[PDB]
Amino acid sequence: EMQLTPFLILLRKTLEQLQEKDTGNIFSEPVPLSEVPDYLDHIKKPMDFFTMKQNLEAYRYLNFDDFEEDFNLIVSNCLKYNAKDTIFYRAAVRLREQGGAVLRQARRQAEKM
């Protein structure tokens, strides 16, 4: 199959590209429960890009689909929690669109290895 090191290099680059699409950095860190005290009542598995970076370096993404699954959680959690008329909801829609294109290109690179 493929070697670990180039795959992790690719995931690192892809994660950076996804964060670049989050210009407000609203997905960069876990949603602050100090300010959203009911968040865990609705969201079973919080996700954010800092947690994704920790998972990456902890060797918890060994295939592309697990990495993409956690990105999709960032999006879906935000769509679930926030009303449609909020900036947060619309930011998740835009991230789904822009991040999907980043991910399709990165997957093509993974399939080259």
Ligand SMILES: CCn1c(=O)c(C)nc2cc(C(=O)N[C@@H](C)c3cnn(C)c3C)ccc21
């Ligand atoms: C879009 C994801 N997201 C949500 O889905 C919901 C429901 N709330 C969010 C709230 C913040 C947030 O509070 N950011 C800044 C003002 C702040 C204030 N104090 N602290 C410690 C921080 C980080 C960020 C993202 C959020």
